Amino acid sequence: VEPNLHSLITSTTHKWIFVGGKGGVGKTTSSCSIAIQMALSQPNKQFLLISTDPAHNLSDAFGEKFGKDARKVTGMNNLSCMEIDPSAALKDMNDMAVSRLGSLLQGGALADLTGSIPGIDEALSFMEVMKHIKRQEQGEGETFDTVIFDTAPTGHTLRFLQLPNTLSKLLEKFGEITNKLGPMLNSFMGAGNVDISGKLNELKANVETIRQQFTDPDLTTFVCVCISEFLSLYETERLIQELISYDMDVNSIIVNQLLFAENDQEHNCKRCQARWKMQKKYLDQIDELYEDFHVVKMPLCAGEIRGLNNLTKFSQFLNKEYNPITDGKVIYELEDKE
Amino acid sequence: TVEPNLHSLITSTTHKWIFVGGKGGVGKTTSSCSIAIQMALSQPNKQFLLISTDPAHNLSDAFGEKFGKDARKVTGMNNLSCMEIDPSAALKDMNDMAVSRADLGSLLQGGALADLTGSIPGIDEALSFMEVMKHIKRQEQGEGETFDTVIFDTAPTGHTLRFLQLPNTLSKLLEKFGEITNKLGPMLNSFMGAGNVDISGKLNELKANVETIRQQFTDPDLTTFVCVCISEFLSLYETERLIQELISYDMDVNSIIVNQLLFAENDQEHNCKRCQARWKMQKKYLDQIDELYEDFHVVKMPLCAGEIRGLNNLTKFSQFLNKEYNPITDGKVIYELEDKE
Amino acid sequence: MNELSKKYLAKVKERHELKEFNNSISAQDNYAKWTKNNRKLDSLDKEINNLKDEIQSENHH
Amino acid sequence: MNELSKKYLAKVKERHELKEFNNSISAQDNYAKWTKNNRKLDSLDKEINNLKDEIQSENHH
Ligand SMILES: [Zn+2]
Numbered sequence A: 001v002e003p004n005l006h007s008l009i010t011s012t013t014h015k016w017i018f019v020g021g022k023g024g025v026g027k028t029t030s031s032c033s034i035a036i037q038m039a040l041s042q043p044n045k046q047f048l049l050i051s052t053d054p055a056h057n058l059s060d061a062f063g064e065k066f067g068k069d070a071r072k073v074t075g076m077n078n079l080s081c082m083e084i085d086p087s088a089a090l091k092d093m094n095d096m097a098v099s100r101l102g103s104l105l106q107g108g109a110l111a112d113l114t115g116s117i118p119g120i121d122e123a124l125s126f127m128e129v130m131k132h133i134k135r136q137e138q139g140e141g142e143t144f145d146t147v148i149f150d151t152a153p154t155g156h157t158l159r160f161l162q163l164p165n166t167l168s169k170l171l172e173k174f175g176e177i178t179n180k181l182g183p184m185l186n187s188f189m190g191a192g193n194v195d196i197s198g199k200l201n202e203l204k205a206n207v208e209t210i211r212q213q214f215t216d217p218d219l220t221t222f223v224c225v226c227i228s229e230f231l232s233l234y235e236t237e238r239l240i241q242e243l244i245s246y247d248m249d250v251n252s253i254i255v256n257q258l259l260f261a262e263n264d265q266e267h268n269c270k271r272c273q274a275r276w277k278m279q280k281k282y283l284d285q286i287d288e289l290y291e292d293f294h295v296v297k298m299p300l301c302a303g304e305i306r307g308l309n310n311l312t313k314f315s316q317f318l319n320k321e322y323n324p325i326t327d328g329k330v331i332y333e334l335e336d337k338e
Numbered sequence B: 001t002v003e004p005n006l007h008s009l010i011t012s013t014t015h016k017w018i019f020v021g022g023k024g025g026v027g028k029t030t031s032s033c034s035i036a037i038q039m040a041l042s043q044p045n046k047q048f049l050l051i052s053t054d055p056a057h058n059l060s061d062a063f064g065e066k067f068g069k070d071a072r073k074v075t076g077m078n079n080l081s082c083m084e085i086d087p088s089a090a091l092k093d094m095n096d097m098a099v100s101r102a103d104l105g106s107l108l109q110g111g112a113l114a115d116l117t118g119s120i121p122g123i124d125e126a127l128s129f130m131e132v133m134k135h136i137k138r139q140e141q142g143e144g145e146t147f148d149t150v151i152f153d154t155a156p157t158g159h160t161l162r163f164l165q166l167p168n169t170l171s172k173l174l175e176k177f178g179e180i181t182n183k184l185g186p187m188l189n190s191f192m193g194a195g196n197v198d199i200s201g202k203l204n205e206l207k208a209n210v211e212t213i214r215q216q217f218t219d220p221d222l223t224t225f226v227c228v229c230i231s232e233f234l235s236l237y238e239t240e241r242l243i244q245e246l247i248s249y250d251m252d253v254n255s256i257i258v259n260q261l262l263f264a265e266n267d268q269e270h271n272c273k274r275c276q277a278r279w280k281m282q283k284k285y286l287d288q289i290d291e292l293y294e295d296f297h298v299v300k301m302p303l304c305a306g307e308i309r310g311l312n313n314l315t316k317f318s319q320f321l322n323k324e325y326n327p328i329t330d331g332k333v334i335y336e337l338e339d340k341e
Numbered sequence C, D: 001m002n003e004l005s006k007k008y009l010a011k012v013k014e015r016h017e018l019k020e021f022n023n024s025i026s027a028q029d030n031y032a033k034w035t036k037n038n039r040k041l042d043s044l045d046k047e048i049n050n051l052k053d054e055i056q057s058e059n060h061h
Helices: A006-010 A027-041 A058-062 A086-099 A102-114 A120-140 A159-178 A183-188 A190-214 A230-245 A270-287 A308-318 A324-337 B007-011 B028-042 B059-063 B087-100 B104-117 B123-143 B166-181 B193-217 B233-248 B273-292 B311-321 B331-340 C003-022 C031-057 D003-022 D031-057
Strands: A016-020 A047-051 A079-083 A146-150 A220-227 A249-258 A294-299 B017-021 B048-052 B080-084 B149-153 B223-230 B253-261 B297-302
Touching: A006 A027, A016 A027, A027 A047, A027 A058, A027 A079, A027 A146, A027 A220, A027 A249, A027 A308, A047 A120, A058 A079, A058 A308, A086 A120, A086 C003, A102 A190, A120 A159, A120 A190, A159 A190, A183 A190, A220 A230, A230 A249, A230 A270, A230 B233, A230 D031, A249 A270, A270 A294, A270 B273, A270 D031, A294 A308, A294 A324, A308 A324, B007 B028, B017 B028, B028 B048, B028 B059, B028 B080, B028 B149, B028 B223, B028 B253, B028 B311, B048 B123, B059 B080, B059 B311, B087 B123, B087 D003, B104 B166, B104 B193, B123 B193, B166 B193, B223 B233, B233 B253, B233 B273, B233 C031, B253 B273, B273 B297, B273 C031, B297 B311, B311 B331, C003 C031, D003 D031
Parallel strands: A016 A146, A016 A220, A047 A079, A047 A146, A220 A249, A249 A294, B017 B149, B017 B223, B048 B080, B048 B149, B223 B253, B253 B297
Antiparallel strands: none
């Protein structure tokens, strides 16, 4: 199985590409690199790169100021970027709801049913992000064909996919109580019990809709980012297993910040060669553990990578696997420039 | 403020149990070794046992001496002994003999045990811990001398100490088992009674044992836990979790050792640009750790690249648990150990 | 409303507001603040869970 | 004994034996083997839990 993401980068079928990874892994650079490599290989298509990481460093990475509103990448025609905060977004929707005792009871009603089930917020939040993307398209006039999602490194953004069945059991729980109301009560209350049922069914609907998409391996895949160090690797196995338990396609693993000290012309660093020894021990381990994955081994370029010019230079190695012998010059130019 | 060192713990005399643990690539073992050595050096009148249950079994490499299940003196010291043990292996061997010593009667008693014991988490870990203790006692009585403090190098995976919560739930199901056996009639109480009484007894012994342990692990003057970590998000995160866990058990946790620090500004030569890049990350989190655990002893240890091996080098390196390493003055001590390698 | 419910609401709300605030902070760029907040949420969660049980038991039939 | 129980025992025992074996392997010095074993334990755990439920329901009154 090819040690690069070339199939993904040439894929016509995908609309959703999630990129996630915990704790210091070059998740964002890897997000960018992917977005770009697809934008190049498919100029006949429009790509949205969106990010919910509160670090909000799409702007630093590209060297260009992005925000809630899509904005074309300077130097490209088919790559746009937004940074959004889903909690903030949802906050704003709920504060609007408020302004528009009756409400207290219904608010109470909802909470009782809902404030207790895990993932409701996460889903509401994701919904609002979908809707916000749509408003960007309808304003611009174009649409996006693929979004590449740079996911927040902490939390369970996609656990709301188990929600639909839960929402079902409790639609009934609630249905078997509202039945026991009589005429007098069903008169003062009925209308708002009808609303409580409404919202709940809508949420289930929406989520089920999302599910059908997310669960189509042709339509949506997840790329894990990690480094070669027990804790990240372990966190990364965890991530896969979770994702699998959501019937979501997880097929690629980018491994970042490899030192490849052996193939080095500095050789100056015993500390670096020491680190490299560990990195390679685990690297062997990955090899015999995810045998049916595209496991892509990326080089450490010291300091940071910024500018579409640099990002692109670096991004090529998701497509054609970096050979430290031959390809060294590229990394050591990038490094020396920073 | 709280001294950035372990001098307090190193000079303490009340402590019988010092647990050292950290997840995943952190210098845990070396840390354990250094704490033991320093304690022994500072308390020549007391007797220390450093015990490791880490499957990697690299006490032997750390000291450059073959340690095993039988406690044995560190060569060059009169009050430090090491031993390496596999608790699961030990417990396994215990149950092989319990089985040998007892076919339907034994299957039923086996099954009954299973239905009460199997589901509950931490049982095997308590039994396991108990076997280790029995073992240490047998070592003491055999060698004719006892240990004053044990220093425990814990395995980097699993939950060594999550059985401290067991006695409560054992009491619960002891009464469940009770309510059921109270409904046996004279006949069945005759064919089974003895087995029922053995089962009750088995459980009470475990509860009592665990309670006996728990009273000790819960005394902050008697036992404490030192977390080991490195200055990187993932580890720091796991370290907080471990602290929180420990606290949930009412265990005393006051110390954190942060290893593998580059201190790259304070040494131009051993640090290529890649290292300086890394040191910036490490430094970032150091500032965080500082405001996050202000009432903790957080001890900043320098990366000594390569690997520390031998009583001599271990000692040279261990001094920095006692007197905070200053990367300026103390520099030459490190790059001396490194360069030897 | 009894002081017990008044407080349950208050906490439940404090907790919510804290959660959304923490979701806007970068765990890596603000490890300390982020962690502190996590602690206060876990704490609020236990208080909330009590007040709930206390309210539920006190309204049972 | 019915085949169902025969198999429940067998698995429950396979699982136990595997757990003690895995506890003797170093997760760091053997990341791959260790991980594979963890997967098999999680798996056996689900099979065991089913066989249990099936045995319990099948013996209810
Ligand atoms: Zn270096």
